[PDB]
Write a protein that binds this ligand. Structure first.
Ligand code: SF4
Length: 85
DNA sequence: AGGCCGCTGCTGCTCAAGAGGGGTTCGCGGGACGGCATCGGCCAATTGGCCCGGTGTGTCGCACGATCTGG
């Protein structure tokens, strides 16, 4: 349908700062990614599943070692066990 | 001979080598002190699963059956 022939051939920016700009969650409620009280961690996991820079997000999160929120489709203890493994 | 009334020339301002003695800085270190930063547990708390148990209302999968248009 309205796919623009996979981004088409009309582009003038020819400039990218980094993989932040390709983040899908930026098009989405930030609050849902930090479940307070008990919360849930599956809808935002589904959102991350379709992210095109999931690997980069996971790598950056692990390298900087944030212990809050859900990054790369994984929550805190998945990151912790991956770090410990 | 002094005072004074003019002339007349001149000048000036402006537009284009050690040596000693003493208080102070800072500069390294140098370590001591106190403090805040990091890591096993840990249980019973909101959301959200995950279902029983009743019908109904309303979509969908297909049976009998009538009307109508084309073949
Ligand atoms: S993987 Fe990272 S960048 Fe992608 S949507 Fe999830 S949190 Fe955002």
């Amino acid at each position: 349908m309205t796919e623009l022939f996979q981004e088409l051939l009309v582009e003038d920016a020819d400039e990218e700062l980094g993989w932040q700009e390709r983040a899908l969650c930026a098009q989405t409620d930030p609050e849902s990614f930090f479940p307070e009280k008990g919360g849930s961690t599956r809808e935002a996991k589904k959102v991350c599943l379709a992210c095109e820079v999931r690997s980069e997000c996971l790598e950056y999160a692990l390298q900087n070692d944030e212990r809050f929120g859900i990054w790369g489709g994984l929550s805190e203890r998945e990151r912790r066990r991956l770090k410990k493994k």
